[PDB]
Amino acid sequence: DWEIPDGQITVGQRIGSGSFGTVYKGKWHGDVAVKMLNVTAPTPQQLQAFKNEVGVLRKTRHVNILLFMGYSTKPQLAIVTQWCEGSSLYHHLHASETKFEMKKLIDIARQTARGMDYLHAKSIIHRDLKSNNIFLHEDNTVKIGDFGLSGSILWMAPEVIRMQDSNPYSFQSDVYAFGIVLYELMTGQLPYSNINNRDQIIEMVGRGSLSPDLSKVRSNCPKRMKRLMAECLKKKRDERPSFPRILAEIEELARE
Amino acid sequence: DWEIPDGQITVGQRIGSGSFGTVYKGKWHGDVAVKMLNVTAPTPQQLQAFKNEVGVLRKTRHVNILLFMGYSTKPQLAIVTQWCEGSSLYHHLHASETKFEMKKLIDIARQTARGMDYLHAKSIIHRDLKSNNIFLHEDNTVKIGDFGLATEKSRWSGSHQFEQLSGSILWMAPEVIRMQDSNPYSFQSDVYAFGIVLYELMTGQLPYSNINNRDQIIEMVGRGSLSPDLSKVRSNCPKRMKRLMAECLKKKRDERPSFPRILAEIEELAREL
Ligand SMILES: Cc1ccc(C(=O)Nc2ccc(CNCCN3CCOCC3)c(C(F)(F)F)c2)cc1C#Cc1cnc2cccnn12
Ligand SMILES: Cc1ccc(C(=O)Nc2ccc(CNCCN3CCOCC3)c(C(F)(F)F)c2)cc1C#Cc1cnc2cccnn12
């Protein structure tokens, strides 16, 4: 069991709110992160969210997935993970001075492909893959999570934006989102940055008129990565590849 | 459940075998290590060891403990973990040119104290803590395990008692060397072993290196005449680390501190600077 008794965890600095609950830095046999429902009387929806989140985190033991360590129910609903030193891939690419060699951009893509390949193998659909949810622990190891701290529409597949079918999230919607991460790495830019109304992107991507401008990839982006990227961004859901095939293509091409 | 179906794991280069199986580099959703029992006809003792090892690894989720990922039963008994890039603390200190600043030696000791404090909180006794079992993943994060490769061969054809002699004896507490108790391993035997790791970090040397009769070390440590020479600690070893070291190396089992107290001391020690 992964339930942590009461009176063991210390809660330190409040980092931010996210998904459901607030994240804190904390102390429990070393540094930890603590996501805590800051509500006196939880609703059933809140309780169920917490159980669903623990339910999935429990199933993960992989170096590229944020390390779940346990949970607590009293005094508040709380999920405990490893603390990560550094900042998100989003921060490095679009909020900072930082410079990546093409070797490291390929490696980030590969570590991300491993973690996503692992999740999909255990029937877990992320639903919100994006560079802000890819953490660079010690600026060296990718850690996938849902860190919380609008936003997500750039990584939304057409079918997801449209919302035609009850809950449109699929392995392939995750694949599309990974495609958009590859765009970020190989261009250094968020897609649709030439278009200035958020409402148009939503209409045009869902309509199928707008997709990322693949001309803006770098001169030294390998040609196979470019082809892959475009295989992931296919507008029809079922033309997209699977992560075993994606992982194999990025590990083949990174050998060279 | 953490059972991995057959025909998913790929086994690559053989890293080393010892008494509890053979470790390989492997592929399963990325790099992994694979400990595989390379025995034609396992005994009940061997089968039970495998179940006990999985049993305890299953209970661990902590950044300073080697990450268990799963196990397989067919075609062979196998435990799967994260692959670690780098080399053991033993390699860096006694088999290498590497130089650690005192900041990093204190940090290695602290990360090791966190992992051990975590294990003891879940009632897990390591039994074989030593610098060869403390891995420096990416030369930055301590990962405690039992890596312990005794030969480089496809299996270990010695006794466990030879294996311990070639390695483990320096980190054995007096009570453990004697074997006067029925099963002499305790939280405190682990504490003694951590004491000897602190000696390694703060001296850069294995203890008793001014002696070569391995048989004498066994008699004299167990007899209580010989303990590590604390004079050989560095000029810039903080005085509180030295005092802690000696509290861990107490010859009487129950005079030794507990890991909550050890960790609290090392985090205060590190606070200063
Ligand atoms: C405390 C905590 C708690 C939870 C999570 C987290 O990552 N949770 C989480 C949530 C979802 C999913 C995947 N989607 C499943 C969707 N399901 C339906 C909706 O409800 C959830 C289940 C995944 C997965 F699978 F991607 F791993 C992970 C992260 C943290 C964290 C931190 C952390 C560590 N150092 C730092 C530094 C700064 C900020 N923070 N920080
Ligand atoms: C594949 C594998 C499998 C298992 C273990 C492992 O470390 N297993 C293991 C064994 C013992 C103990 C602690 N002993 C107390 C509990 N025990 C239960 C059974 O009865 C009493 C003993 C612990 C613990 F708790 F410390 F984690 C862990 C390590 C590996 C490995 C590798 C590995 C990863 N990259 C590298 C690189 C080079 C060499 N290798 N390599």
Residue numbers in the entry:
A (entry chain A): 449 to 597, 614 to 720
B (entry chain B): 449 to 721
Pull text from the paper:
Our structural findings based on co-crystal structures of Ponatinib and PHI1 highlight that each inhibitor recognizes a distinct allosteric site and induces distinct dimers and αC-helix conformation.
Using this approach, we generated PHI1, which uses a morpholine-based head group predicted to interact proximal to the BP-IV site. To investigate the structural basis of BRAF inhibition by PHI1, we determined the co-crystal structure of PHI1 with BRAFV600E at 2.65 Å resolution. Comparison of BRAFV600E-Ponatinib and BRAFV600E–PHI1 structures demonstrated a major allosteric rearrangement induced by PHI1 binding promoting an inward shift of αC-helix. This PHI1-induced BRAF conformational change is compatible with kinase domain dimerization, as a BRAF dimer with two PHI1-bound protomers is found in the BRAFV600E–PHI1 crystal structure. Interestingly, this PHI1-dependent allosteric modulation stabilizes the αC-helix in a tilted αC-CENTER conformation, distinct from αC-ΙΝ or αC-OUT conformations but closer to αC-IN, which we termed αC-ΙΝ* (αC-INstar). This structural change is the result of positioning of the morpholino-based head group of PHI1 in a previously unrevealed extended allosteric BRAF site, which we named αC-allosteric site. In contrast, PHI1 positions the morpholino-based head group between the HRD motif and αC-helix, having van der Waals contacts with HRD residue R575 and residues N500 and V504 of αC-helix that result in additional 38 A2 of buried solvent-accessible surface area. In addition, the specific hydrogen bond between the nitrogen of ethyl-amino linker of PHI1 and the main-chain carbonyl oxygen of H574 is maintained. We found that PHI1 inhibits more potently the second site of p61BRAFV600E dimers when the first site within the dimer is occupied, uncovering the first paradigm of positive co-operativity for RAF inhibitors.
